[PDB]
Design a protein around this ligand. Structure first.
Ligand SMILES: [Cu+2]
Ligand SMILES: [Mg+2]
Ligand SMILES: [Zn+2]
Lengths: 308, 392, 248, 144, 267, 307
């Protein structure tokens, strides 16, 4: 069983194909991330999952049906980015408006206003709402009814860092129930702790898809090991350089090792055997660095020393 | 045609003064001698329906108190009730009752005839084209027709080429024309009352005459019609509620060049005054244009000042002020817009007359005076009613 | 039915518009102030009320619905609303019902206080003619407003920004109120009767403000065609607005 | 094509301006066919006084007067009724018309020249007629 | 100077407003059209009172179209809070906006009454070029001052509000009140009282409306008729000379700019 | 010593929305200000820019007064959301800010190429995306060699290649000697680039210092997980001998919450027996440290899914 089965679509506008040979399969409880830069593929893929567009050379099977059935869209939440609701309406009346359209019960309105933390600012106008206050309202209409698929296009813009981490804490409660959701973001640290499998895509195609352990294994990326005073910087700068790893000669009492994480199994044995591990920080190659790798891999040239 | 001596007149006084007793008579009658005959109130001289009933050919005859009934109707042979020959100078026709389908009092070529106090009820069924005139006057100099009561005749008091004569205080009801004037130079008429008439006062081609104090109550389609009158004087006339049947004009000035039109009262008609393009530059000042749905109709682009000696007319829709406390207003009053004459020049604009663009175009003229065509304005209009006595 | 669930939004959002309530108050004040100066100073005052409601009922309709489609696209809720169980027809027809009952209420405060100022300040108005001449007046003033409501949905679906929608809604209000009849008057003066007399009445049927006055001034055409020609201005322009809204 | 027909006069025909009965008068009697409704006039000078108003300058209407070169002056027949723009009016004669100045209309210009020398008048065309001339000619006829 | 560096923006930002260039070309094509109708009707006191009525409807309109979003359009746009962290004061980013929007009105009326004069010197033959230059020189240096009044009015209603949608409501209220409501309130006060409310106070109410002081300046030498003026016939009862009418037009700027600065100083 | 805030307790409306923050900022550090319930985040932002008056205390920016024109040419402020002037172009907007700040006009052509906006230069700002306006908003902040940047969320609406390149541009300016303040709410990702965080809540500045100090002054469990372990049944128990709960959620996802007091013997347990694949010493991040200091002042932990 798969929620979204994008099966070989190829969406074009005129002669240009803005999305070519996209082949996704979102699971039953997975949190997938659509990340795109040059391409408009990210925006078009989002539209294809919804009923907004039609696949010009393929088909999509959202929840085992066509994406434009009314039985699909009653169990499909979608928070769009930069949404600004009807500002003369109130916060409770906007959710009571959206509950009538999705067929949700009206006893779920006061629960979801309480669930997103909008109980104090309910019965106030949407014009006197903040940016993150409207994101709590825009999230609350996506949870109306019992949705089986959420498309959170940039959910944490202008949101407080408690409420940002509380939102992803609501996500892992949701995906345990069986609601497989999709993150669409541009802030790549922060989504990387909750993304089940990334879907980094280039201009046209889909570059890489799979979990973070599969992206780090395929893309050979060096580990970013930083330390501070194990034994000595200069006595430890020499050892990784004959073995073929980079040891950065920083200012004082800091050992930065950029190792290639393939031989580091037995290399860390000598680090334990001669010193204390009491202040080290081994950093895996992050989702920010993995996404920068796949852009360079297809159709891109790195910006300069410090440019953009 | 018998004579008046063929009746039985009992003489009250032996100075050619006779008195006919009460009792009916028959046939036409003729006065050939200067007899000042009076009559009892039961003297119903009823002719049979043909010929002029009481023909008069002698001078200085004071016919008084007779009651004539049912004379002829041949208007070509002038079948009158009282026919007065040119030789019958200075005749007095006093306090008589007439009912018959022809002329009531036909005079011609007479001098100093006095037609006083009669009641002439004309007809009921004829189509107002063969009813005959109430008081027909044909080229008489010196006449004095005073305080009569003409009802249901054709064209009331007709006057043809009669020079000097007064028409004082006579009531004219349910006729086609109230008073008809044809080429009557140096005439005069005072205080006449016209009711329910298809034209209240016909003023056709008669110059130098005085029209003063007359009243027109509920006439049809023409209050006072003036064609080609020069050097006249229209002072104190009260024209009220000229309903349609024309759309209803209280005064219709057609080719009248010089005349003084002051102190009148044009009330509750559809058009207060119609000024044609040929009739321009005459002294129109001091009137009261109250209650009319449209005050002046002047289809021209020539300017026309309507205030002599700095005093203008009272207008009911004059929304102006008076700061220095005189009788005159401070801003001038234009009775016509530019879009109020597009309706007259082009009748298809009547479909567009309720449009907001017309209501825009009424405001653009008040803001941008370059598009204002020169109309029929009066500097210094009156603030109060000048005709405070004419409403009684 | 979801054509009513989205209509209840537009009632609650339209009645809190401060721009609308200023004009609808000014419509009710000027309808009393014309009726006060038309009785103390009824077909003579219902013609001046027809020229008033030709100014403001297009203005009320274009103030409500110039940002109905493109105001939701700029707000981002239009892309959200299409992912709901909702067709593009039910959004448009539900906005037309919701905005329609607003100006169907704006004539009941507009002429409901104007007919109150006539029935209580004439004293002998013969009110049996009043409730039929104002029943024909309140119905025909809503249908004039429903044309310009459907005109506002045409210009909302075409533009992509909210600022250029008000630049076209001002252009539609200028053209259909006081430019179409000024180019009627302009042709007549230059023609000097060259223009056909018969042709001009028919050309009033190409203007819903003109068809509005012709069913308050009662002519080669009958009355019943003008009611079916005013409703044809609703039904064509709503069908045109639905054809534009399906091409976004 | 309804303006092409000069209609005949009846006895119950009032003038458009003065409103009185037309056929009780001598002289030529103008009339104006409008093709939406015919309006008639008691004299030709009262028709030309009506024609020079600015409501009727733009009005597309054919003007018809009598031909006094083929008719007796006291009772003109309906009959021959020429177009008034192409006529030859004489002015200033001592003949007694109905309302305005006496403007005997002709069609052949020699009979118009016959009556001009026979009464002391001047022939003039239709376009030379203006409102400065109608009020001048009626003052010389019905004045002094 | 910093007042000119921020005037150079508004001079180059108002000229890209397409709504300005429409209704400033409308001021040019109407001032030719009024002067052409004033040339075909040859008259002279009617084409002065109608041109001054044209700039009564449009020079407040161009001034309020420019500057209704001058302060609050930058505050909610975010670029006002940034501008105070530049080496500036609040008095320089207001006087600079007044100079920048003021030179647009000095150019929108030099185009309008400039081409209106060329539609007179090339249309009416034999006109007095000395009298034409003097009358249209008085029109130019007084329609800017009427424009600069409503420019300084718009800075008052921009500093007071905190939302640009409400600034357009107040700018429409200011344009309706001063142009065609104060002329109708004074008319209805004179009509219903028949000029007997106050025979000496009522001419002083013309000085409480800068559009009426503008009409009183240009209708000085060409009085002409009375009904073309309307409620400006009260201006014959004002005992002030012509020089005070210039000074009451300048005082409408300086009080309503110091009010515009004192409001903006506590923004 | 660029920003020297000392003793400032800003009051307005007798509300006391800021209290006694002593925030000295060095001449090369990258400070971060993070605010939730407290309004200090915005008031302090203003206070450094000089557009607010410090009641009961002194603010010394760059050794001088905060509202002097000689130091206000040396600041750079990227505000929250600036849709600048939609009818002006890209060069004409930046030449306008170059004339105001006194910068040389030759910097404008080399800042529209330094920031990636030379293709969209001489194009109107109404045709700009939100990311292109953040690119333009940064371009006036680097105008005329600023010795103090002050960025209020510079990476909102921005693509991740430019986000990584913006922090490389920040790291170039740190070496040049210009102190930068990164006031953000995008706390994951900014912790790799700042030098000292400053979490302030309810007005009072709760915690200040480097990221190594905030973990030392707050006992938080270090989350060592060793994905890809050989044996798993004894690894459920072999960490709990010194009080480190080896809780796992997958086939090998033992996220061992340690105590940061026995880091030698657990790694000697890890490297003495059993082979790893990719060890993940996951330090308590800035998202986790922020919710400790917030909860320590006023905040109570929200429920199961209730924010
Ligand atoms: Cu007659
Ligand atoms: Mg006065
Ligand atoms: Zn006649």
């Amino acid at each position: 069983m798969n929620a979204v089965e994008i099966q070989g679509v190829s969406q074009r506008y005129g002669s240009m194909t803005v999305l070519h040979d996209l082949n996704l399969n979102l699971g039953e409880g997975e949190v997938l991330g659509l990340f795109g830069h040059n391409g408009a593929g990210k925006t078009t893929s989002m539209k294809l999952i919804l009923g907004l567009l039609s696949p010009s050379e393929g088909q999509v099977k959202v929840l085992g049906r066509a994406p434009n059935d009314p039985q699909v869209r009653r169990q499909l939440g979608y928070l769009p980015e930069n949404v600004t609701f009807y500002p003369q309406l109130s916060g409770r009346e906007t959710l009571r408006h959206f509950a009538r359209l999705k067929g949700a019960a009206l006893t779920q309105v006061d629960e979801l206003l309480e669930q997103v933390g909008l109980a104090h600012a309910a019965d106030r106008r949407v014009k006197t709402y903040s940016k993150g206050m409207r994101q709590r309202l825009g999230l609350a209409q996506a949870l109306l009814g019992e949705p089986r698929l959420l498309l959170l296009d940039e959910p944490t813009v202008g949101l407080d860092p408690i409420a940002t981490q509380d939102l992803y804490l609501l996500i892992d409660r949701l995906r345990q129930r069986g609601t497989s959701i999709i993150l669409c973001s541009h802030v790549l640290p922060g989504v990387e702790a909750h993304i089940n499998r990334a879907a980094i895509l280039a201009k046209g195609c889909l570059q890489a898809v799979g979990s973070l352990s599969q992206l780090r294994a395929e893309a050979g990326l060096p580990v970013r090991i930083r330390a501070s005073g194990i034994s000595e910087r200069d006595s430890w700068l020499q050892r990784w350089t004959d073995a073929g790893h980079s040891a950065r000669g920083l200012s004082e009492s800091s050992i930065e090792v950029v190792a290639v994480n393939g031989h580091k199994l037995v290399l860390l044995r000598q680090l334990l055997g001669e010193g204390e591990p009491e202040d080290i920080e081994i950093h895996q190659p992050s989702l920010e660095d993995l996404y920068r790798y796949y852009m360079e891999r297809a159709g891109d040239v790195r910006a300069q020393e410090g440019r953009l | 045609a018998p004579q008046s001596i063929t009746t039985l007149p009992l003489q009250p006084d032996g100075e050619n003064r006779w008195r006919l007793p009460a009792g009916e008579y028959q046939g036409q009658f003729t006065i050939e001698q200067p007899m000042q005959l009076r009559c009892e109130p039961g003297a119903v001289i009823q002719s049979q329906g043909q010929g002029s009933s009481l023909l008069i050919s002698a001078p200085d005859v004071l016919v008084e108190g007779c009651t004539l009934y049912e004379w002829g109707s041949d208007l070509t042979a002038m079948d009158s009730a009282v026919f007065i020959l040119p030789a019958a100078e200075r005749a007095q026709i006093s306090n008589n009752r007439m009912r018959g389908p022809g002329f009531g009092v036909f005079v011609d070529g007479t001098r100093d005839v006095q037609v006083i106090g009669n009641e002439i009820d004309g007809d009921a069924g004829v189509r107002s084209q063969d009813r005959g005139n109430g008081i027909h006057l044909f080229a008489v100099s010196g006449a004095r027709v005073l305080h009569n009561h003409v009802r249901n005749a054709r064209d009331g008091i007709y006057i043809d080429t009669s020079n000097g004569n007064h028409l004082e205080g006579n009531v004219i009801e349910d006729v086609r024309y109230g008073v008809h004037y044809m080429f009557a130079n140096e005439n005069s008429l005072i205080d006449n009352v016209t009711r329910r008439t298809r034209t209240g006062y016909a003023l056709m081609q008669s110059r130098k005459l005085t029209v003063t104090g007359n009243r027109s109550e509920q006439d049809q389609n023409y209050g006072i019609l003036m064609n080609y009158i020069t050097y006249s004087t229209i002072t104190g006339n009260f024209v009220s509620d000229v309903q349609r049947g024309g759309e209803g004009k209280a005064l219709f000035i057609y080719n009248s060049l010089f005349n003084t039109i002051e102190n009148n009262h044009f009330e509750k008609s559809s058009l207060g005054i119609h000024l044609t393009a040929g009739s321009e530059d005459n002294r129109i000042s001091g009137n009261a244009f109250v209650g009319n749905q449209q005050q002046v109709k002047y289809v021209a682009s020539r300017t026309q000042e309507w205030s002599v000696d700095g005093r203008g007319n009272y207008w009911s829709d004059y929304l102006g002020w008076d700061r220095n406390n005189d009788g005159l207003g401070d801003i001038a009053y234009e009775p016509n817009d530019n879009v109020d004459r597009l309706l007259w020049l082009y009748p298809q604009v009547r479909l567009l007359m309720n449009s907001p663009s017309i209501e825009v175009l009424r405001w653009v003229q008040r803001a941008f005076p370059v598009i204002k065509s020169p109309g029929v304005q009066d500097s210094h209009p009156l603030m109060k009613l000048p005709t405070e006595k004419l409403l009684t | 039915n979801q054509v009513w669930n989205i209509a209840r939004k537009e009632l609650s959002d339209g009645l809190r518009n401060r721009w609308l309530l200023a004009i609808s108050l000014l419509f009710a004040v000027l309808a009393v102030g014309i009726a006060w100066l038309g009785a103390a100073a009824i077909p003579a005052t219902i013609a001046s009320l027809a020229s008033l409601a030709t100014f403001l009922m297009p203005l009320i309709a274009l103030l409500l619905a110039y940002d109905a489609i493109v105001g939701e696209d700029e707000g981002g809720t239009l892309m959200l609303l299409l992912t709901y169980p909702l067709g593009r027809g039910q959004i448009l027809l539900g906005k037309f019902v919701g905005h329609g009952l607003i100006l169907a209420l704006a004539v009941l405060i507009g002429f409901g206080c104007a007919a109150l100022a006539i029935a209580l300040l004439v004293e002998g108005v013969e009110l049996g003619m009043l409730f039929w001449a104002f029943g024909r007046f309140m119905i025909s003033s809503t249908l004039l407003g429903w044309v310009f409501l459907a005109f506002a949905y045409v210009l909302s679906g075409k533009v992509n920004e909210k600022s250029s929608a008000a630049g076209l809604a001002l252009g539609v209000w200028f053209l259909f109120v006081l430019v179409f009849d000024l180019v009627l008057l302009a042709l007549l003066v230059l023609s000097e009767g060259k223009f056909n007399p018969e042709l001009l009445p028919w050309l009033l049927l190409l203007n819903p403000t003109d068809i509005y006055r012709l069913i308050n001034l009662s002519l080669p055409v009958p009355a019943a065609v003008l009611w079916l020609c005013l409703l044809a201005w609703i039904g064509v322009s709503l069908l045109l607005a639905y054809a534009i809204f399906r091409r976004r | 094509q309804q303006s092409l027909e000069p209609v005949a006069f009846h006895d119950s025909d009032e003038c458009h301006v003065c409103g009185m009965i037309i056929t009780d008068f001598p002289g030529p009697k103008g009339q104006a066919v409008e093709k939406r409704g015919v309006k008639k006039f008691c004299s030709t000078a009262e028709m030309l006084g009506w024609w020079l108003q600015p409501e009727n300058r733009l009005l597309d209407a054919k003007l018809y007067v009598h031909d006094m070169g083929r008719s007796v002056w006291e009772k003109p027949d309906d009959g021959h009724l020429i177009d008034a723009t192409s006529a030859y009016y004489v002015v200033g004669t001592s003949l007694k018309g109905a309302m305005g100045a006496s403007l005997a209309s002709f069609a052949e210009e020699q009979d118009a020249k016959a009556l001009a020398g026979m009464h002391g008048g001047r022939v003039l065309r239709f376009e030379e007629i203006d409102q400065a001339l109608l009020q001048e000619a009626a003052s010389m006829q019905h004045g002094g």
